[PDB]
Amino acid sequence: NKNQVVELTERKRQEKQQEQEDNMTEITNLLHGDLLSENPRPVASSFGSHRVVL
Amino acid sequence: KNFINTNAADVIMGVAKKPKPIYVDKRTGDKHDLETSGLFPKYINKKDYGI
Amino acid sequence: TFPTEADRQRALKAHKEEYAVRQGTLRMGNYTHP
Amino acid sequence: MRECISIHVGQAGVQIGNACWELYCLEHGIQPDGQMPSDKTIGGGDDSFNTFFSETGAGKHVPRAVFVDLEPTVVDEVRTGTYRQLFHPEQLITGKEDAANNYARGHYTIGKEIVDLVLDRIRKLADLCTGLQGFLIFHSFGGGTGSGFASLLMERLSVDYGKKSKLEFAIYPAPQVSTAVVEPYNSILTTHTTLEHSDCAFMVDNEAIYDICRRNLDIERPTYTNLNRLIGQIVSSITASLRFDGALNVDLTEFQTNLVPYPRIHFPLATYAPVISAEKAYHEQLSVAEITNACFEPANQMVKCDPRHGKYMACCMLYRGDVVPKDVNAAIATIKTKRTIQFVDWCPTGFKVGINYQPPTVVPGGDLAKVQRAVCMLSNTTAIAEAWARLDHKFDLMYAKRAFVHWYVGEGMEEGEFSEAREDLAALEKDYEEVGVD
Amino acid sequence: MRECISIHVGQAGVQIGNACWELYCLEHGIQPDGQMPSDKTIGGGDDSFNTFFSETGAGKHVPRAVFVDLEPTVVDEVRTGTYRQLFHPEQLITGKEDAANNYARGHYTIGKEIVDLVLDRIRKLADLCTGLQGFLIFHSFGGGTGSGFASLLMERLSVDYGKKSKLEFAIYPAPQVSTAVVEPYNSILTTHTTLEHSDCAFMVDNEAIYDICRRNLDIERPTYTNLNRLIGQIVSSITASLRFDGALNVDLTEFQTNLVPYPRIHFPLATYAPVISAEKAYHEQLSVAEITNACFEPANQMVKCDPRHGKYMACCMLYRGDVVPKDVNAAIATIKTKRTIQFVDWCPTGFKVGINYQPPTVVPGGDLAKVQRAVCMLSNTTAIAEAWARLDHKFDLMYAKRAFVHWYVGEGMEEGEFSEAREDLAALEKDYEEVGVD
Amino acid sequence: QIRLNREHKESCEMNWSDKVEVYNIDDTCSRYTNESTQVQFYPHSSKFEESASTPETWAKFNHDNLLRAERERLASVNLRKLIDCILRDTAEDLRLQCD
Amino acid sequence: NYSANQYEKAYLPTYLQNWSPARPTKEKIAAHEGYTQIIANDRGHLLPSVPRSKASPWGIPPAKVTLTARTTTAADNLTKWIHKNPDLLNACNGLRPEISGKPFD
Amino acid sequence: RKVGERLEDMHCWKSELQREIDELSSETDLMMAQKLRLQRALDATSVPY
Amino acid sequence: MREIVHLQAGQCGNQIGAKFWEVISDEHGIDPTGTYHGDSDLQLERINVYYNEATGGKYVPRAVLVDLEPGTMDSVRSGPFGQIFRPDNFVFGQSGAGNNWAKGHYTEGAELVDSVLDVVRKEAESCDCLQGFQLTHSLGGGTGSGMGTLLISKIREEYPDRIMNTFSVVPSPKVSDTVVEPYNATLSVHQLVENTDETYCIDNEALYDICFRTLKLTTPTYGDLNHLVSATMSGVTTCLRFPGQLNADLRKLAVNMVPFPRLHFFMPGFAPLTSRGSQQYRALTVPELTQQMFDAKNMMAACDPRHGRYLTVAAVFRGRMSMKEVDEQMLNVQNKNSSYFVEWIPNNVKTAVCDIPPRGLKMSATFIGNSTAIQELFKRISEQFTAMFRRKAFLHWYTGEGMDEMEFTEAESNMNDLVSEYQQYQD
Ligand SMILES: Nc1nc2c(ncn2[C@@H]2O[C@H](COP(=O)(O)OP(=O)(O)OP(=O)(O)O)[C@@H](O)[C@H]2O)c(=O)[nH]1
Ligand SMILES: Nc1nc2c(ncn2[C@@H]2O[C@H](COP(=O)(O)OP(=O)(O)OP(=O)(O)O)[C@@H](O)[C@H]2O)c(=O)[nH]1
Ligand SMILES: Nc1nc2c(ncn2[C@@H]2O[C@H](COP(=O)(O)OP(=O)(O)OP(=O)(O)O)[C@@H](O)[C@H]2O)c(=O)[nH]1
């Protein structure tokens, strides 16, 4: 029982470590989110440089 | 309008409607027509057979 | 459930007088408690 | 011989049956492939699995259960799961159209065309089986596809096959939680249709299942796997008599004959006492007395019924593990001496003991504790009528303002059927106090 | 001894006989060239081929069948196939003019000058034969060249030889599929000519042949190769009693004596029970009990008939492979007790059992299963009249408005033959009802 | 990285193989009974009692090898993601320049 | 379609797993006399004189229950709620259930 | 009894190392595919220069 | 299997589906060219609910685009995803609408309804069995209202057994630009309530505030607004395509929604809206999600139902959640505002949880609302119609087309009858 409980606690710690890294990776995506960053580069979906996407 | 009371009357005299006898075959077997399936229908029911 | 209608009428009056005191929505459960 | 068949209706009934069969393959040591190791247990299908699996000369343990569904969504990934090779492909009844929570839609629109197929599955299961004591029906009262489809099948299996038992298992509607408001529509429709046909209906409620776990299992964050783990343990415990012997063996036939007092009401309540965390099991001691106190402690029941608000008729205890007749008979004798426990004066004895040598096992990657002495508490009390009493005031308001009927009358019913169930219920409630009256 | 001759008429009959002969060489291991390996089986023509092939001192197995056709296309292309060296050139009776789907065009215009040549084939085959029990006529009711030409040959072989059996096999017209609208016209013409002469006619329908192909063989995209493989297996199974022995051996005479109740009607139905995909056969098991139910399962019949809509008169089961008397005699006893099985009370006994030890073999590059226990189910029931009843309410319409007759009367007929055939069918239906009435 | 992964594959494979044969022989031998055949008298010996290993140490070996493979697979996944990102950036820069 | 003799234990639903009784059977036949005339021509055609089964066969609320103790008025309907359905009282595997119970006072 | 215990103990490790080798092979195939993709990109690189 | 065929209407819709479809392709990992990159197994099999198969692993959209002006179609064709759309699906006319409702409903429609019905039935036979259809259009849109009202009517008798999902944007209450727009809207809704089964209500002014509230980016593009609504309509459709213990059918949802047949108008609700610092200042927890889910600012559809009461509510949760939190959160809100619901229905909450997170966030949700807040919407347009019909402004055009005032009489009357419907139920 104790050994099962001891390893049960370890799974808790690991999934804490697992759920933590999910947050920072989630934070990273929001940082690079194009909707958030609103780059003026992807607005030129037109073929000719003299013409823009309205 | 007591359209509340109408809805009662609407469904009170709503009678009912009918389904259609259709069957299926397989795992993802489709809705194969039972009605006049040509397989298990009531075909011999007309005053023309034999006589 | 009752064998005799006399016991049926005997039972109902016994619970009718004991209606309000008894717990449960139908007032058959037990008041109990100290 | 001694075997039975399991049925899983409603998209909720399939994930729970999955876990149950997942649980069942452990104690037999079943590999996911479908075969044992080079060890010799295969044959014509006769060993511990013969009651449950069908491992013929092909060597593949074929479970004796049919999973029925109306939506391809939840039934396909299980067909792509880990044990899908074990499952018979056309035993996993799928559909392409839903019942839309509508009893009648499943009961009329789609029920006709699929029941004939499953009836074929039933008969080709029936021919291969030998004694086939009864059926294991896994469903749900708020069955999105369970409600209508279970009703029609249990009608058809009752009318053609009436000489055996039919064991019913559904989640009881949550008293104060409702994920659907058409749920009362079909739930009462299911109940009134099932009262005159169902043999043994056993209910359960998820809220108290959750309430238990963060009480003593101490997990504030369980999962359906945890929920399915507990209920799968329940059905495992009751089938341990089939799986294992003991001082005495009992069967569902005894369960039916001895539990139900009188017709109509056939709705006992299950319970499992040694519910505790592994750590709390680790540095504490288990014996018959405290679990006998725990099993009858009012907060250990998954159904929201204050047992003191009602009175008991029957109580079945199924001790699985290392127990002796001495303490248990003394302990239950003390239970009879207790005053707060109020069986009806009608029954002198209402206790059906089950003894099984086998200590129940833990599941790898599981959450339960390691138990040596277990007990399952199937019991019936008069404290249950409040639930249907809760339903009627819920329903009586709704039907007076007749919400959602435009759908139901829209696809082919009338109001007479809805009328019948209410005096059907009014019969059940009025009967409940009459038998409750001594 | 124990031998027969096969005939393949109609451009439909030409591929099917080829595949049967293609099948037949496999179980004897015949090489496409025409000779066995250095192993010794040749002689004066006396071995397992002596009933099927004529492998004389020349050493070449010569199949005992004649392929008759009216269009050079298919007959010449098979003459450039793989086994064309085996076949007899002018046994492949070719034609330069078609019957134009017209029965009588095939029956009168060209059949006169060709039958005499075919008759020479018959007598030159007849003289060399020894036992010559009967003939294996492969045709089709909607015979574009089969209908007319098979009728005339059957007449001439009936009149000259009336002392032996004549076994007929035709694709029954598809009840809801009509690739020709003259197909009814000639079909009824074929029926009325054959009722007073034909010995045993066995039909089958392509639509249901496909229906299994994706049901249990699980092929949504099979081809005639699979279809001819299925029917080639069927005729192989019925000839296995000739090819090999078993617990008991049965001959075509016994079937004829035991199948036809009363004169005219000689039209039973064929069905083969162990029809399943290879992988489904892989992890499952076969025994007599389940295959008994499947062959009598109503959806397993290749004819669009509900046995519950009719009543049974004859049923023949031929078990090819490893079987024992104990289970089969018990298994059939189960069927006699079955309530759905509604035999006519005229026959307390309506079963003919054939046991053959030989496990049916697979064909290289085939799609069949791996069968050890096999049974082909030949049966006759009253549920067949709907097919002819389907034809007459079809036929009566067109005949009332006499469509396409300008061709038939144009090239030499009148309405009298059409007039005669209809009351014969009307006789058959009332006969079918009078036998149906007890 | 490919080379390293294949080497680790081979090592774990050979150990798996060994446990396979030992398990098979153990199962085959376990079927023995007192009255049946395959029953022979020999003299005793000392290789009967030769000492080379202990279960906990054996389990240590197995777990360590498991960890080796685990880490190498982690590194492979990381490298793959890095490669994909590099490709993305390269393509974008070339596009802008030509425009 | 008869029941056999003596060895009447080898043929039962015990192996059939039959949950609707197969067919009532018996072992008794009245001593039949009769030259057993033939009354057809070639086709099952009864000669018009002799009679047949004159086109008799040609081709849910019912459930097992005992009345036991459930209110008389409810029970009375149940009896009618069982019967009045020949589509389930006549043929085709039998279609016919049983019944029991006891009255009230 | 002791022999049976030892046997089941062995069977466990057999199972997990089976599965472990399996996913290793799968991941190796994945890096095969990605390496080939990089090779194709390098092939395409040349022309604009 | 069951599937859906989509209909693309209105010039606003021409943008709507464009953003909506590219989100799906990017969500499922298909390139703009059309060659899917096998990355997630689950999205591979359940792509046939919306897309059919083309050669070379190309997933053809089963949607139909319809308009009158070639330039917009040329633009959407020249977009990053115009290649995945089919030239077959590009049906249109060669006329200018004047964005007149009647012209798009009687004059220009007559010669195109034949053609467009052929395309849909061609697509309908291309598939086996549908749930139904959904339409992206506008009620205030001139050409979209004209076409859709025609198409919805025709498809009703065509398939009276399916789901007639409708997606329309409500114009800005403060300003409509189009001055005849209330005429266009009131006409359309008259048939719409007659024909539709489900309808979403969307307002730009609320979207404008949301940009001021959480986007905080001052100047967006209209497509950015479309990105939001496309995410919402994607989220509700995620339940169909993705696994998880939640039931997917809109009818399964619909049978949980509509108390009485005239309830077709429903309002959306969406998942974490976050600003610059709050992305790294948010502890993503089901409580704070649920708190944000029922925020008076988080709503975007029409207006604040703080004024009215809540008839039926349904929130679908996309991510790694469990029954317990949504249960207690439902209890918390139930105890939070017990009186704010209606005594006519208790337990008016309908819950579903999707276990498959979106690509970009883990724990998300979507809300669809049925409350008593729509009264403000059509009471505004009620006087709008009366004031303009008081002196029949801009009416000679419709009479020249062949329209008469009597058509307006029942349209407003039917509208008024529905207004009395909402209150006398609730009040
Ligand atoms: N026993 C059990 N019940 C569940 C589970 N998940 C949800 N439920 C409840 O059981 C009910 C199942 O009924 P339905 O929702 O109609 O499910 P269904 O009939 O199989 O098909 P759907 O309508 O598609 O959902 C739901 O309303 C839930 O409240 C589960 O995992 N196990
Ligand atoms: N048994 C069999 N039937 C076929 C095959 N191919 C087509 N059929 C069907 O069998 C029928 C053959 O009858 P007919 O068309 O009259 O053929 P025929 O009498 O030999 O001569 P034709 O008029 O030239 O075609 C066709 O109508 C087809 O529908 C085949 O390969 N084998
Ligand atoms: N495409 C697009 N439409 C918008 C935008 N903002 C508001 N809308 C409205 O969305 C409505 C629907 O478009 P359609 O139905 O195609 O328009 P229409 O029928 O040609 O008539 P109009 O309303 O005059 O354009 C239009 O009426 C616009 O008023 C926007 O930013 N882009």
Give the pair of three-digit tokens for residue I410. 């029942």
Backbone angles phi, psi at D358, to 5 degrees: -80, 120
Q: Contact, D429 vs D385, CB < 8 A?
A: yes
- What dihedral angle (degrees, nearest 10) is formed by the CA atoms of D185, D186, D188, D192? 130
Resolution for this PDB entry, in angstroms: 6.5
Helix (H, G, I), strand (E, B), or coil: what is residue E395?
helix
Closest by Cα among E414, E381, E377, E390 to E313? E381
Q: How far apart are CA A26 and CA A15, in angstroms?
A: 16
Cβ-defined contact of B3 to I128 (cutoff 8 Å): no
Q: Contact, E187 vs E141, CB < 8 A?
A: yes
Give the pair of three-digit tokens for residue D20. 């149950």
Q: How far apart are CA E234 and CA E252, in angstroms?
A: 15
How far separated are the first and last CA of chain F, in Å rounded? 37
Q: How far apart are CA E189 and CA E421, in angstroms?
A: 7
Helix (H, G, I), strand (E, B), or coil: what is residue G36?
coil
Q: Which of E140, E189, E209 to mutate to test the pocket of ligand 2 (most atoms within 8 A of CB)?
A: E140
SS3 content of chain F, % helix, strand, coil (to 5): 75, 0, 25
Determine the Cα angle at I46 with ends D89 and I90, to 5°.
Answer: 140
Q: Which residues contact G25 (CB under 8 A, 6 or more apart)?
A: G1, G2, G3
Helix (H, G, I), strand (E, B), or coil: what is residue I267?
strand
Q: Contact, D3 vs D132, CB < 8 A?
A: yes
Q: Which residues contact A40 (CB under 8 A, 6 or more apart)?
A: none
**Nearest bound ligand to the CA of residue D143:** 1
Residues with CB under 6 A from ligand 1: D 10-12, 15-16, 71, 98, 101, 140, 142-146, 171, 179-180, 224; I 245, 247, 252
Residues with CB under 6 A from ligand 2: E 10-12, 15-16, 71, 98-99, 101, 140, 142-146, 171, 179-180, 224
I65 Cα distance to chain centroid: 16
Closest by Cα among E193, E187, E186, E92 to E152? E193
Q: How far apart are CA E175 and CA I234, in angstroms?
A: 48
Determine the Cα angle at D353 with ends D349 and D356, to 5°.
Answer: 175
Q: Which residues contact D156 (CB under 8 A, 6 or more apart)?
A: D115, D119
Those residues of chain E whose CB sits closer than 8 Å to some CB in chain D are 280, 282-285, 289-290, 293, 297
User: Would strands B32-33 and B22-23 be described as parallel, antiparallel, or unpaired?
Assistant: antiparallel
Numbers of helices and strands, H then E, in chain C: 1, 0
Q: Mark residue E27 as left, alpha or beta (left: phi above 0; alpha: psi -120 to 50; beta: remaining).
A: alpha
Cβ-defined contact of D308 to C30 (cutoff 8 Å): yes
**Alpha-carbon dihedral sign for residues H42, H43, H44, H48:** positive
Closest by Cα among E289, E287, E246, E270 to E373? E287
* Total Cβ atoms within 10 A of residue I77: 15
Cβ-defined contact of D437 to C11 (cutoff 8 Å): yes
Q: How far apart are CA I178 and CA E98, in angstroms?
A: 75
Q: How far apart are CA E246 and CA I129, in angstroms?
A: 52
Q: How far is CA I381 from CA E229, E325, I183, I208, in A?
A: 73, 87, 9, 21
- State in Å: Cα I110 to ligand 3 middle: 22
Q: How far is CA I194 from CA H48, I152, I153, I404, in A?
A: 61, 10, 9, 20
Helix (H, G, I), strand (E, B), or coil: what is residue I23?
helix
- Give the 3-state DSSP-derived string for chain D, with helices as H, strands as E and coil as C: CCCEEEEECCHHHHHHHHHHHHHHHHHCCCCCCCCCCCCCCCCCCCCCCCCCECCCCCCCCCECEEEECCCHHHHHHHHCCCCCCCCCHHHEECCCCCCCCCHHHHHHHCHHHHHHHHHHHHHHHHHHCCCCCEEEEEEECCCCCHHHHHHHHHHHHHHHCCCCEEEEEEECCCCCCCCCCCHHHHHHHHHHHHCCCCCEEEECCHHHHHHHHHHHHCCCCCCHHHHHHHHHHHHHHHHHHHHCCCCECCCHHHHHHHHCCCCCCCCCECCECCCCCHHHHHCCCCCHHHHHHHHCCHHHCCCCCCHHHCCEEEEEEEEEECCCHHHHHHHHHHHHHCCCCCECCCCCCCEEEEEECCCCCCCCCCCCCCCCEEEEEEEEEHHHHHHHHHHHHHHHHHHHCCCCHHHHHHHCCCCHHHHHHHHHHHHHHHHHHHHHCC
E strand or H helix at I165, and its extent?
Answer: strand I163-170
**Alpha-carbon dihedral sign for residues D290, D291, D295, D301:** positive
User: Would strands I364-371 and E65-68 be described as parallel, antiparallel, or unpaired?
Assistant: unpaired
Q: How far apart are CA I371 and CA E58, in angstroms?
A: 95
DSSP designation for I214: I
Which atom of ligand 2 lies at the shortest distance from residue E142's CA?
13
Q: Is D27 annotated as a binding residue?
A: no
Looking at beta carbons, which residues of chain I come within 8 Å of D406? 260-261
Strand partners, E376: E272, E318
Closest by Cα among D184, D178, D234, D185 to D207? D178
Q: How far apart are CA E396 and CA E422, in angstroms?
A: 9
Strand partners, I317: I353, I365
Give the pair of three-digit tokens for residue H11. 């069977």
Q: How far apart are CA G34 and CA G37, in angstroms?
A: 8
How far separated are the first and last CA of chain D, in Å rounded? 42
Give the pair of three-digit tokens for residue E182. 């003259």
Helix (H, G, I), strand (E, B), or coil: what is residue E126?
helix
Helix (H, G, I), strand (E, B), or coil: what is residue G93?
coil
Q: How far apart are CA E147 and CA E144, in angstroms?
A: 6
Q: How far is CA G100 from CA D166, G78, I66, in A?
A: 21, 12, 70
Q: How far apart are CA E335 and CA E377, in angstroms?
A: 14
Q: How far apart are CA I256 and CA D404, in angstroms?
A: 9
**Alpha-carbon dihedral sign for residues E352, E353, E356, E362:** positive
Amino acid (one-letter) located at I40: S
HSE on the CB side for E20, CA within 13 Å? 27
Q: How far apart are CA G31 and CA D307, in angstroms?
A: 71
DSSP designation for F36: S
- Altogether, the residues listed in chain B come to a count of 51
How far separated are the first and last CA of chain B, in Å rounded? 63
Q: Which residue's CA lies nearest to atom 16 of ligand 1?
A: D144
D379 Cα distance to chain centroid: 13
Determine the Cα angle at D80 with ends D75 and D85, to 5°.
Answer: 105
Strand partners, I137: I168
Establish whether E254 is a catalytic residue. yes
Q: Contact, I132 vs I152, CB < 8 A?
A: no
- What dihedral angle (degrees, nearest 10) is formed by the CA atoms of E329, E332, E338, E341? -150
Q: How far is CA I38 from CA F78, I35, I58, I61, in A?
A: 19, 9, 12, 18
Give the pair of three-digit tokens for residue E271. 């069905």
Closest by Cα among E402, E433, E406, E394 to E419? E402
Q: Contact, D233 vs D190, CB < 8 A?
A: no
Backbone angles phi, psi at I91, to 5 degrees: -105, 140
Closest by Cα among E327, G22, G21, G17 to D1? G17
Q: How far apart are CA E198 and CA E179, in angstroms?
A: 26
Amino acid (one-letter) located at C13: K
How near does any CA of chain I get to the CA of B20, in Å? 13
Q: Is E380 annotated as a binding residue?
A: no
How big is chain D by its Cα radius of gyration, in Å? 22
Those residues of chain D whose CB sits closer than 8 Å to some CB in chain F are 37-39
Q: Contact, D319 vs D354, CB < 8 A?
A: yes
- State in Å: Cα I144 to ligand 3 middle: 8
Q: Is E55 annotated as a binding residue?
A: no
10 Å CB burial of residue C10 (0-12, 13-18, 19+) is exposed
Cβ-defined contact of A23 to I360 (cutoff 8 Å): no
Strand partners, I413: none
- Give the 3-state DSSP-derived string for E34-89, with helices as H, strands as E and coil as C: CCCCCCCCCCCCCCCCCCCECCCCCCCCCECEEEECCCHHHHHHHCCCCCCCCCCH
Experimental approach? cryo-EM
Catalytic site positions of D? 254
Q: How far is CA B19 from CA D147, D413, E321, I52, in A?
A: 19, 11, 47, 31
Measured between CA atoms, the residue of chain D closest to residue A5 is D279
Give the pair of three-digit tokens for residue E183. 């197909």
Q: How far is CA D94 from CA B29, D75, F42, I190, in A?
A: 10, 6, 64, 41
Q: How far apart are CA D431 and CA D428, in angstroms?
A: 5
All chains having 3 or more CB pairs closer than 8 angstroms to chain D = A, B, C, E, F, G, H, I
- State in Å: Cα I101 to ligand 3 middle: 12
Q: Contact, A20 vs A13, CB < 8 A?
A: no
Q: How far apart are CA D183 and CA D144, in angstroms?
A: 9
Helix (H, G, I), strand (E, B), or coil: what is residue E249?
coil
Q: Is E13 annotated as a binding residue?
A: no
Strand partners, D4: D134
Q: What would the DSSP string read from start to end of I58-79?
A: EEEE-EEEEES-HHHHHHHHTS
Q: How far apart are CA D21 and CA D66, in angstroms?
A: 12
